[PDB]
Design a protein around this ligand. Sequence first.
Ligand SMILES: NC(=O)C1=CN([C@@H]2O[C@H](COP(=O)(O)OP(=O)(O)OC[C@H]3O[C@@H](n4cnc5c(N)ncnc54)[C@H](OP(=O)(O)O)[C@@H]3O)[C@@H](O)[C@H]2O)C=CC1
Ligand SMILES: CN(Cc1coc2nc(N)nc(N)c12)c1ccc(C(=O)N[C@@H](CCC(=O)O)C(=O)O)cc1
Length: 186
Amino acid sequence: VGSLNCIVAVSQNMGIGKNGDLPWPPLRNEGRYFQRMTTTSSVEGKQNLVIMGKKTWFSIPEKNRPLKGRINLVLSRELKEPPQGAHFLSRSLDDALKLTEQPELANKVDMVWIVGGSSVYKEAMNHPGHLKLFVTRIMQDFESDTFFPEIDLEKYKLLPEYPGVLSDVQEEKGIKYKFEVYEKND
Ligand SMILES: NC(=O)C1=CN([C@@H]2O[C@H](COP(=O)(O)OP(=O)(O)OC[C@H]3O[C@@H](n4cnc5c(N)ncnc54)[C@H](OP(=O)(O)O)[C@@H]3O)[C@@H](O)[C@H]2O)C=CC1
Ligand SMILES: CN(Cc1coc2nc(N)nc(N)c12)c1ccc(C(=O)N[C@@H](CCC(=O)O)C(=O)O)cc1
């Protein structure tokens, strides 16, 4: 119903995951930022929806499942029912959005956040319309097995700043990263 957004942490080499997990050691403030961005609703009495592929859901520690204070939807064409803890199961990205306009959720949901698989990002990315990409740039190489798709700079513009998002280089466990926001409308 509100805004459609993607959120991702990528290494210098475009890597997002290795063996079902993150390619770098745990970065707690990066995690806190993920949580803060997906969780904050811009409107009273509304909640954000988080859309993720099946392998992303299973990579969140069980004790954090479902992500608290968010509506959790899992995408899969193989599952019959949402996995244990999940609220909704959709067979495609169109259906997950079509569901949003269902009287059920229609008045409950503010923003919609895509929190991954590459598969999921690739598709959201080509979706027609207004979209924002929140990209945490991890500034080093990390051996990965799953990568984020290439951002087309002829369609996405890097914003010079964004309210509530730090513009300076962060550092944790001696890993430098920075937060970026890109916008499209076509
Ligand atoms: N650094 C970061 O920001 C992020 C890192 N990660 C990490 O990346 C990896 C997760 O990877 P990835 O393989 O890309 O997995 P996804 O989470 O995208 O899982 C893909 C599975 O999900 C379902 N699916 C995906 N896209 C769709 C669609 N459009 N319609 C329907 N079903 C879909 C299918 O399930 P089925 O086979 O059941 O049909 C497919 O097998 C892990 O290593 C994880 O830890 C994940 C997200 C963000
Ligand atoms: C593999 N993923 C995707 C993921 C991790 O880091 C990211 N960072 C960004 N910037 N985007 C993403 N999509 C992710 C996730 C794994 C676990 C949790 C998780 O445990 N989340 C808790 C917060 C835990 C904390 O305190 O860090 C939550 O409430 O979101 C989230 C995402």
